[PDB]
C-alpha cells in the first residue's frame, strides 16, 4: 500500500462491463460516474493504482476519508473521478505463518497529497533527540507490516484494491468502451449511425470505387451520398427516404 503500483492505460477499448461481472468484488464504489455508464464514455487516461489493504481500512479508500492509510499511504483527491474496486483475496495474500510482504506507513511528518507515493524508509524521529539512522527511544521505523493469516478476522483479511482514475477530459480521448454492432439493414428506410455520423435513409449496395483511405462520399452540395461500413469494408449508397407532396 505504501508502494502502490500505478499503471497508465491508453490506446485501447475498455470493456468495464466484463470486469464488473468477472469476480466477487466486495466494493465497487464509483465516484463521479455510474459504473453502467462506463461503457458509454471515452477517457483521456486510465490510472490503475493497485495495492493490498486490510479489511477494516478498505473504507479509508474514498474521497474525504481520514486515517493512517488515507494520510500516510494513499490519498484520494476530493475531486476524485473514478472507481474503487476491492475484493477479499484471502486465498492469495494470506499465509499460515504470516505474510509480511505488505507494509503500510505508520509515522510521517505530514499527510500525503493526493496521488503521492512516498517509499522512504528513514527512521521517523518522534522525540527531540536525533535518531541518526538508528531506531530506539523516540525513534520508530515508519513502515509496519500487516501479517495476514488465513485464520485472521474477516475485517483483518487482505483486500486487493484497484483504484481506476479516469482523466475526464475527452479532448485526447483514447480509452473508450465497447462498440455496438446492430445488424445492417439494406433496401429499407432506417436511421443509420456510421462512426458517430447520424442520418436517415435507405442503404443499398454501391459500385463506387472508394480509395482505401476514404470513409464516405459526398455529393456536389456536400450531402452525404455514400458511406463505408466500419465493420465490413464495403460501400453503401445512402438515398433519402421517399417524400413528396400529397395533393387531392
Amino acid at each position, epitope marked *: 500500500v505504501y508502494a502502490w503500483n500505478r499503471k497508465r492505460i491508453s490506446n485501447c477499448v475498455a470493456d468495464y462491463s466484463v470486469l464488473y461481472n468477472s469476480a466477487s468484488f466486495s466494493t465497487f464504489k464509483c465516484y463521479g460516474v455510474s459504473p453502467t455508464k462506463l461503457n458509454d464514455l471515452c477517457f483521456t487516461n486510465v490510472y490503475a493504482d493497485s495495492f493490498v489493504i486490510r479489511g477494516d481500512e478498505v473504507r479509508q479508500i474514498a474521497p474525504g476519508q481520514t486515517g493512517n492509510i488515507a494520510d500516510y499511504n494513499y490519498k484520494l483527491p476530493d475531486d476524485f473521478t473514478g472507481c474503487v474496486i476491492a475484493w477479499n483475496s484471502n*486465498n*492469495l495474500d494470506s*499465509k*499460515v*505463518g*504470516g505474510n*509480511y*510482504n505488505y*507494509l503500510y506507513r505508520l509515522f510521517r511528518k505530514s499527510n500525503l497529497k493526493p496521488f503521492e507515493r512516498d517509499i522512504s*524508509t528513514e527512521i521517523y524521529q518522534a522525540g527531540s533527540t536525533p535518531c541518526n539512522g*538508528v*531506531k530506539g527511544f523516540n525513534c520508530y*521505523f515508519p*513502515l*509496519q*507490516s500487516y*501479517g495476514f493469516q488465513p485464520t485472521y478476522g474477516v475485517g483483518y483479511q487482505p483486500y486487493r484494491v484497484v483504484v481506476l482514475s479516469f482523466e475526464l477530459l475527452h479532448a485526447p480521448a483514447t480509452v473508450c468502451g465497447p462498440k455496438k454492432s446492430t445488424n445492417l439493414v439494406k433496401n429499407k428506410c432506417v436511421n443509420f449511425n456510421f462512426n458517430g455520423l447520424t442520418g436517415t435513409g435507405v442503404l443499398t449496395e454501391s459500385n463506387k470505387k472508394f480509395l482505401p483511405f476514404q470513409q464516405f462520399g459526398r455529393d456536389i452540395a456536400d450531402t452525404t451520398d455514400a458511406v463505408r461500413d466500419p465493420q465490413t469494408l464495403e460501400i453503401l449508397d445512402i438515398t433519402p427516404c421517399s417524400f413528396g407532396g400529397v395533393s387531392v
Partner: antibody
Amino acid sequence: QVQLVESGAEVKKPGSSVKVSCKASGGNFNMYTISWVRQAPGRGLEWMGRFIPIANKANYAQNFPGRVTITADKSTSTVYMELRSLTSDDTAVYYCARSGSYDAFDVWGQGTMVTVSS
Amino acid sequence: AIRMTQSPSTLSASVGDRVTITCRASQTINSWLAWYQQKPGKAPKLLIYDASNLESGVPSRFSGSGSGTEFTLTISSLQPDDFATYYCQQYESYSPITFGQGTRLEIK
C-alpha cells in the same frame, strides 16, 4: 550485492545445544526475513524457522516444537538461530536464507557444518 | 503441513536434450512455488519463483509452468553445468515450509 556470512563449523555432543549466526551485510535488514534451512547428508533440504525483522517476530517449524529459538540483534544486523537438544540426527549444514522481494530464498549463506557426536 | 512430492526422484539425460521435472503438491498452493539448484558442496541458488518467473542471472533455458497442485520445471537445452539436484519450495504456508524430496540429474 547482499552477502550473508555465517559462523564457523561447530562440533557438539548429543544432548547439548548449538547457536549459529548469520551476519546480514548490505541492503535493508528491517524488511527482508531470514530463514534457516538445514540439509542432512544424503537427504534433501529441510526448513527450520524464520525471523521477521519488520514485525520483530520469530517463527518455528511445526516439526520442531520448541527446539528452535531465533533471535537477532538489529543494531549489528546479525541473526542467531538456537537449536536445543542436539541428537545424532541433527548433523546437518545450517544455511540461512534471505527470503527477499518475492518470498523466495534468493540469497543463501555460505552454510556452517554442525556435527553432533560423542 | 503441506507435503511436496517430486517425480522423478532420480533422472538421467544427455547434453542438449529436454528434461521435465514434476513436483506435485498435496494442497492448493496457488502459484507460490520456487525451484532451486544445489550443486554438491554449494548452497542452492534460486532459479524459478512464483512457479513461472525466471530469477535474474539464471540462463533463459530454464522454464517453469503449472499452478494449483502440480508444477513442472523444464530445461529447453540441457547443459553440462545444469547437472545438480533441483528442489521445489511451497511458500504458501510458513508453518512449515516444505522442500521437495530432491531431483538429482545425472549424465546419461
